[PDB]
UniProtKB/Swiss-Prot annotation:
Assigned protein family: Belongs to the band 7/mec-2 family. Flotillin subfamily.
Protein name: Flotillin-2
Description of how the protein assembles with itself and partners: Heterooligomeric complex of flotillin-1 and flotillin-2 and caveolin-1 and caveolin-2. Interacts with ECPAS.
Tissues in which the protein is found: Expressed in many tissues, including suprabasal epidermis, hair follicles, heart, lung, thymus, spleen, liver, kidney and brain. Not expressed in skeletal muscle.
Protein modification: ZDHHC5-catalyzed palmitoylation may be required for the formation of higher-order complexes and for neurite outgrowth in cultured neural stem cells.
Intracellular or extracellular location(s): Cell membrane; Membrane, Caveola; Endosome; Membrane
Function per UniProt: May act as a scaffolding protein within caveolar membranes, functionally participating in formation of caveolae or caveolae-like vesicles. May be involved in epidermal cell adhesion and epidermal structure and function.
Domain of life from the UniProt record: Eukaryota
Protein's gene: Flot2
Length: 143
């Protein structure tokens, strides 16, 4: 599946990058699939934005979105590794907050600022959890 969009100029407009990762064994050791969804945009410098401008000048829109997307993406995995399969689902809103909180002060190196970070869908390709199907059960007790 190839892409095709007319445009021979940088697109300052806000860029929508979805930091998704597959086959990322959680803290315990369970590979999960997180789509993730975050928005980003180019930053301006009243002085000189040659740090991001020259870094995007000449390249192709796709390239840019990739570079930026990578920064966030990578982080996700790192934050997903230290986080188990529970902590994640339990408080997803937080998980994303970390990926953005850790990448926020990072993208500032290239010249990009993050707007927001959220989670789209988190499923397990190995269908491990599903198979287990967590359900309320009953059990006997002595006293």
């Amino acid at each position: 599946g190839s892409s095709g969009s007319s445009g021979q100029r940088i697109s300052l407009e806000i860029m929508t990058l979805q930091p998704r990762c597959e086959d990322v064994e959680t803290a315990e050791g369970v590979a999960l699939t997180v789509t993730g969804v975050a928005q980003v945009k180019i930053m301006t410098e009243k002085e000189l934005l040659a740090v991001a401008c020259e870094q995007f000048l000449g390249k192709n829109v796709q390239d840019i979105k990739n570079v930026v997307l990578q920064t966030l993406e990578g982080h996700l995995r790192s934050i997903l590794g230290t986080l188990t399969v529970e902590q994640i689902y339990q408080d997803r809103d937080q998980f994303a907050k970390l990926v953005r909180e850790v990448a926020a002060p990072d993208v500032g190196r290239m010249g990009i600022e993050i707007l927001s970070f959220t989670i789209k869908d988190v499923y397990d390709k190995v269908d491990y959890l599903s198979s287990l199907g967590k359900t309320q059960t009953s059990g006997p007790s002595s006293g």
